């Protein structure tokens, strides 16, 4: 057989979806040579002097969401792309062709290389996976898309029924922000609906994995 095709903004009218992450601590803080990330428990002077908070700043939320999302069965069936709106407004589009390491050191090194580069490359030297569309996600996304915020405060329903009710030409999108203290309003203006899946508060990795499990049993993905 063969794997499914590239699931990105190029795959627009076909069967595809978008997983959207936002309100994470993802920037380039160079320690005074190279480029480093904003860590709470590691740097004490730097984090306190930056102006952020230990409870507020969270750089591993994106790494955890990528670890819980890139290995999804629907992602190996070719149905999801990744859209990331960073704290500095950076919008990143990721195809499911590769899988970032769950090691936050290695994932943070790759993220710092992307932050100092905005350019990733393949081993085969034929498919630069890290694309950057015109920001935000909805400026170059598929022509038929469904936008909804999966909130713990919105109407909690089963993920199988709502996804099965969706058409195969639309692109269901979910916005997740894993703030230790926050609210489901990071991409509220982008979402066209407000739905719930869990009855307890969960991070972006847990909500994303629940959505992936619902999508896997939706159209047998």
């Amino acid at each position: 057989p063969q794997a499914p095709p590239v699931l990105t903004s190029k795959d627009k009218i076909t069967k595809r979806m978008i997983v959207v992450l936002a309100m994470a601590s993802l920037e380039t803080h160079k320690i005074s040579d190279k480029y480093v990330l904003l860590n709470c428990d590691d740097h004490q002077g730097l984090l306190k002097k930056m102006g952020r908070d230990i409870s507020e700043a969270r750089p591993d939320i994106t790494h955890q969401c990528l670890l819980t999302l890139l290995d999804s069965p629907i992602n190996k069936a070719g149905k999801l792309q990744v859209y990331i709106q960073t704290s500095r407004g950076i919008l990143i589009e990721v195809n499911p062709t590769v899988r970032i390491p769950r090691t936050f050191k290695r994932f943070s090194g790759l993220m710092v290389q992307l932050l100092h580069k905005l350019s990733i490359r393949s081993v085969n030297s034929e498919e630069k996976l890290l694309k950057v569309i015109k920001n935000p996600i909805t400026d170059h996304l598929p022509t038929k898309c469904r936008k909804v915020t999966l909130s713990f405060d919105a109407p909690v329903i089963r993920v199988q029924d709502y996804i099965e009710k969706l058409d195969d030409d639309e692109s269901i999108c979910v916005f997740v922000g894993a703030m230790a203290r926050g609210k489901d309003n990071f991409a509220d203006e982008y979402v066209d609906e407000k739905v719930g899946l869990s009855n307890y508060p969960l991070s972006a990795s847990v909500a994303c994995s629940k959505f992936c499990h619902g999508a896997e049993d939706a159209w047998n993905i």
Partner: protein
């Protein structure tokens, strides 16, 4: 494959009609036929890839 041979055992049941091993063999064959559903069994499946 026990269709003719048990019938041959049935022929044994029609040969002397006094042996005891042939009746037990026929009963065992009947029990094996009744326990078996004799439906079907196939496979040959596939999927995508990484």
């Amino acid at each position: 494959i026990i269709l003719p041979i048990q019938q041959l055992l049935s022929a044994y049941t029609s040969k002397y009609s006094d042996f005891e091993k042939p009746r037990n063999i026929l009963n065992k064959v009947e029990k094996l036929t009744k326990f078996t559903e004799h439906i079907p069994l196939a496979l040959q499946n596939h999927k995508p890839v990484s």
